[PDB]
Amino acid sequence: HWGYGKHNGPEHWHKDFPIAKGERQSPVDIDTHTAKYDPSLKPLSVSYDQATSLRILNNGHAFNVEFDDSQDKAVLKGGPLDGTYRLIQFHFHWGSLDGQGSEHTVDKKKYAAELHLVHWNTKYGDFGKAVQQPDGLAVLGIFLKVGSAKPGLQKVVDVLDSIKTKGKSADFTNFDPRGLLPESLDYWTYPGSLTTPPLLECVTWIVLKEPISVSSEQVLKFRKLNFNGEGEPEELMVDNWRPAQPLKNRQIKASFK
Ligand SMILES: S=C(S)N1CCOCC1
Numbered sequence: 001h002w003g004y005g006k007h008n009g010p011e012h013w014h015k016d017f018p019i020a021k022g023e024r025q026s027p028v029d030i031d032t033h034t035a036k037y038d039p040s041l042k043p044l045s046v047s048y049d050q051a052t053s054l055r056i057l058n059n060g061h062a063f064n065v066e067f068d069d070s071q072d073k074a075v076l077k078g079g080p081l082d083g084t085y086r087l088i089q090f091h092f093h094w095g096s097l098d099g100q101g102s103e104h105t106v107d108k109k110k111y112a113a114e115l116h117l118v119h120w121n122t123k124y125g126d127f128g129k130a131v132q133q134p135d136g137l138a139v140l141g142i143f144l145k146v147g148s149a150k151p152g153l154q155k156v157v158d159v160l161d162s163i164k165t166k167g168k169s170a171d172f173t174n175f176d177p178r179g180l181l182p183e184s185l186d187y188w189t190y191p192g193s194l195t196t197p198p199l200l201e202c203v204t205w206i207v208l209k210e211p212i213s214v215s216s217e218q219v220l221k222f223r224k225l226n227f228n229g230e231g232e233p234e235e236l237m238v239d240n241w242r243p244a245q246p247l248k249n250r251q252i253k254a255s256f257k
């Protein structure tokens with residue numbers, strides 16, 4: 001099965017998922033000098049006040065914090081988007097070392113980790129239908145750098161001991177994802193894909209310019225998770241990122257000058 005090891009990692013995925021070599025794959029390098037300011041791009045609208053988190057799951061490649069997406073409780077609108085996209089889950093990608101871990105890069109710079117807040121277009125009714133559409137998902141990407149702690153992240157860090165291994169889940173109600181956002185909502189946007197198999201080309205990427213800072217202790221706790229199931233040899237869950245893919249026939253747009 002696919003993963004992030006030498007024998008099943010990103011260089012292998014194309015054999016099961018040929019779209020890996022497609023025309024709108026993610027992540028990409030964001031060349032800040034070549035991105036074009038688009039004065040027509042609207043401000044982003046992030047409406048998370050009514051968010052209802054439910055559960056946190058180690059799925060063997062990351063951990064997902066899952067939300068009730070059966071009503072418009074936490075939605076993303078505006079920016080490059082037409083219509084309303086509902087938050088279904090967030091997860092991260094991170095490194096074994098602070099100098100790597102993000103999937104997008106900025107002028108080839110790698111951050112320690114990258115948060116993905118995953119939303120689906122409500123005109124398609126459910127997530128499984130949305131991922132089959134070119135405008136099915138909107139993923140809000142946020143870079144993490146190591147420095148001061150992010151207080152709003154700590155409740156996530158503290159439950160990780162209870163979902164160490166693949167397939168473990170825990171109740172995770174009343175978590176407020178607003179605590180994960182930076183001050184600025186300035187962003188870059190481009191059309192792309194899921195960064196894990198099935199690599200579907202269904203995502204409008206919105207990547208925030210401003211990283212959040214997390215502490216060394218917070219990211220160290222991410223690195224104590226396991227890719228393996230309980231009772232299997234321990235494989236630390238680190239370096240669960242796909243490297244930058246060719247931009248091909250795409251232009252990255254900026255919401256800011
Ligand atoms: S944003 C990305 S990396 N995800 C979305 C949800 O399903 C797995 C892949």
Ligand SMILES: [Zn+2]
Pocket residue numbers: 091092093116195
């Ligand atoms: Zn992701």
